[PDB]
Design a protein around this ligand. Structure first.
Ligand SMILES: CCCCCCCCCCCCCCCC(=O)OC[C@H](COP(=O)(O)O)OC(=O)CCCCCCCCCCCCCCC
Ligand SMILES: CCCCCCCCCCCCCCCC(=O)OC[C@H](COP(=O)(O)O)OC(=O)CCCCCCCCCCCCCCC
Lengths: 385, 385
């Protein structure tokens, strides 16, 4: 409660924004002359205010567009069907009851398709609207009056929500994508250092946050776009896809870190006295990889290009020294007597797996540097200080 | 569309069940004497029918319980606050508008806690109810009448939905958990065989479905409990947790299969002519592991206990033969000349990683056999034919 509020002041702002919107809708109704027939309609503005308020501006705009297309296609089919109904004559109710069944079936069967498993709220409004216009007395006169007053209150509530959401401390989805990329870059370096230290000591969240985030990145990329230019992002079409391309290169790099974490929780392990022969070479690769990932995170955060020197020279030298050391002392992993116990041989062969996985991790960083160059080129980053 | 319907006949049943419930709520309103004031309330039964209908019986019961606790705590605070309001006197509206803000803030701030990120629908109903009872004329007389008629229509819609959901082709969540475990057991064996074949040939969905399913398993475990005894599950407290314990042992086994799939997409690879020396030993382990996983899946599906013989004898013999073969020909992975090129040495050392990962996969199956014995003991499985 208090802890999350002090750590996260955005949540308190969002909650006081919704409180203010509700108190404004309330004020605009408490100051009208007391009427019995006005209080009954008031519930629709409260429902609109409590349904259309989202966390981001792009989310609010996209969901409002979808809900308006739903409500209008529903009112359209309804008005394009009650006319066919009138033609039937006496057997009018049977036609309506037989059309509500088919609309319910199609609107419940088209919401269950794996490709259409996000926009359930454009289908629910369609069904609710179509059903409400055939069992409410379309042929009376009080119908149109009630419909008009309800739509008026709904439009008032949506206008209030949209103004109190767009003009007071707006939250943008592009800043959330921008910050998420930097956080993942930091976490992968922390996990790599923790893994090397744990293996050499006589991590889950780091690689897990990276591996399990593509859905969030694509959702935030789907909303950023609605939003208009603001602050550092001033072009109309901002290359938001290059951020997902760099996050994918980093996930490919983080899978080897997940396999090095898995090497520490295995049933077959190597003798401790034999792991202390390669400690220096193993620790150098970790130090250099963490330094490189942290410098790439700092360059992404500041929106700066890469300088003249090469960023992969020390890590390559470290991995070549590691390979030389392994070649010098490779008689500790195999048994030369048998050249022509199972547990002992597997425990000796277990160290080579850790070393090979570290070398594969160092070989997978060139694609991440290439994706960073592509993003720094398409987004018009500034020349380094 | 048609393809998914022919493959999945359950979706068509669910959609025709919702269509039937809507057509029944419609019939019970079209046959009452034409009234202008009755048609206006009809929308609430349609809304209830379209909101309370879930895919499973346990989900419907749990969500109905939560929505009823919400609505009653809201109406309770409202009636326990409007009285304090009356005491204020002239400055009555100010008190109401000042209480709606604090309720909106607390109900928007308590829905954002990571532990409370499932029951947003017990908070939305609370807010909607509390707000609707303070800006609707609590001190008039028409208020109680409208409230009573609206609650009557809501209860009618919920009763119809619950009867047309529980008495026509009910879907149970325990059969979905039961079937999901068997599907994951089949998929892991398919992935293992595909991985060994791809590596030896001159898979994603299998291990991915297992790795990414704990959330589904725990959701299905959270509803299968509200459901009453039926069919093969006749005890009141059915051990549904042992199914999740066996799924977790299988996920631990599937992580090595994900690392063997990752070994095929690496930048450093071994010469093809050197991979053909261990083909037979490598293929035997795969055949035996797939046979064991398929026999465990068949025993879980039929609800049968294990027989007298040991199920891990052939796989253990295969892995010991593999280790012997590797020991006989280990001069192909290292360089003895240097005993005291980087790419060549890494490519030679890459085969040992595949072999060590296969041996770790074979060493991780005893815990899965132990978890299966525990489930076959707590669930009172039958003695093998
Ligand atoms: C380019 C312009 C874009 C338009 C901008 C305005 C944005 C409007 C988006 C919100 C509109 C949907 C309402 C959402 C709130 C809500 O109450 O929606 C609440 C629920 C949805 O609930 P959930 O989505 O939470 O499950 O649906 C409804 O009850 C609304 C359906 C109508 C209610 C009965 C009134 C009949 C309609 C009267 C008007 C006639 C329309 C048809 C004429 C042909
Ligand atoms: C042993 C107890 C078991 C009881 C089982 C009964 C299950 C019924 C649960 C349904 C209740 C929630 C409604 C769901 C449908 C819906 O319309 O709910 C629709 C929306 C919820 O929308 P979403 O959840 O989809 O976002 O919320 C509402 O509009 C409901 C608010 C109540 C309706 C306004 C009128 C006030 C209520 C009048 C009665 C006063 C009650 C308080 C008296 C103290």
């Amino acid at each position: 409660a208090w802890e999350m509020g002090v750590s996260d002041p955005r949540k308190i702002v969002f909650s006081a924004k919704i409180g203010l919107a509700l108190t404004i809708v309330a004020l605009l109704i408490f100051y009208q002359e007391p009427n019995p027939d006005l209080s009954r309609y008031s519930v629709w503005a409260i429902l609109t205010v409590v349904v259309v308020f989202e966390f981001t501006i792009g989310a609010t705009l996209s969901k409002g567009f979808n809900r308006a297309l739903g409500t209008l296609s529903a009112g359209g089919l309804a008005l394009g069907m009650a006319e066919l109904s009138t033609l039937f004559g006496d057997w009018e109710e049977i036609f309506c009851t037989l059309s509500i069944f088919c609309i319910g079936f199609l609107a419940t069967f088209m919401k269950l398709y794996p490709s259409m498993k996000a926009y359930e709220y454009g289908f629910r409004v369609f069904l609710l609207t179509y059903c409400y216009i055939l069992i409410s007395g379309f042929r009376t006169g009080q119908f149109i009056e009630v419909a008009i007053s309800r739509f008026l209150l709904i439009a008032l509530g949506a206008g209030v929500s949209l103004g109190v959401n767009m003009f007071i401390y707006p939250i943008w989805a592009g800043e959330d994508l921008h910050n998420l990329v930097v956080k993942n870059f930091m976490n992968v370096a922390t996990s790599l250092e923790g893994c090397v230290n744990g293996y050499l000591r006589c991590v889950y969240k780091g690689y897990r946050s990276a591996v399990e985030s593509t859905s969030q990145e694509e959702s935030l990329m789907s909303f950023a776009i609605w939003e208009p230019p603001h602050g550092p992002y001033k072009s109309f079409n901002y290359p938001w896809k290059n951020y997902v391309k760099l996050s994918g290169a980093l996930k490919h790099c983080a899978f080897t870190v997940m396999a090095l974490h898995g090497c520490i929780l295995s049933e077959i392990q190597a003798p401790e006295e034999r792991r202390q022969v390669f400690r220096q070479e193993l620790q150098r690769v970790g130090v250099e990889g963490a330094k490189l990932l942290r410098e790439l995170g700092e360059k992404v955060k500041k929106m700066e290009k890469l300088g003249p020197v090469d960023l992969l020279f020390e890590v390559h030298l470290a991995a070549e020294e590691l390979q030389h050391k392994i070649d010098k002392k490779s008689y500790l992993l195999v048994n030369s007597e048998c050249w022509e116990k199972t547990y002992e041989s597997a425990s000796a062969l277990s160290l080579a797996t850790f070393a090979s996985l570290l070398i594969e991790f160092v070989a997978r960083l060139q694609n991440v540097v290439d994706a960073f160059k592509e993003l720094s080129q398409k987004a018009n980053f500034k020349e380094p200080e």
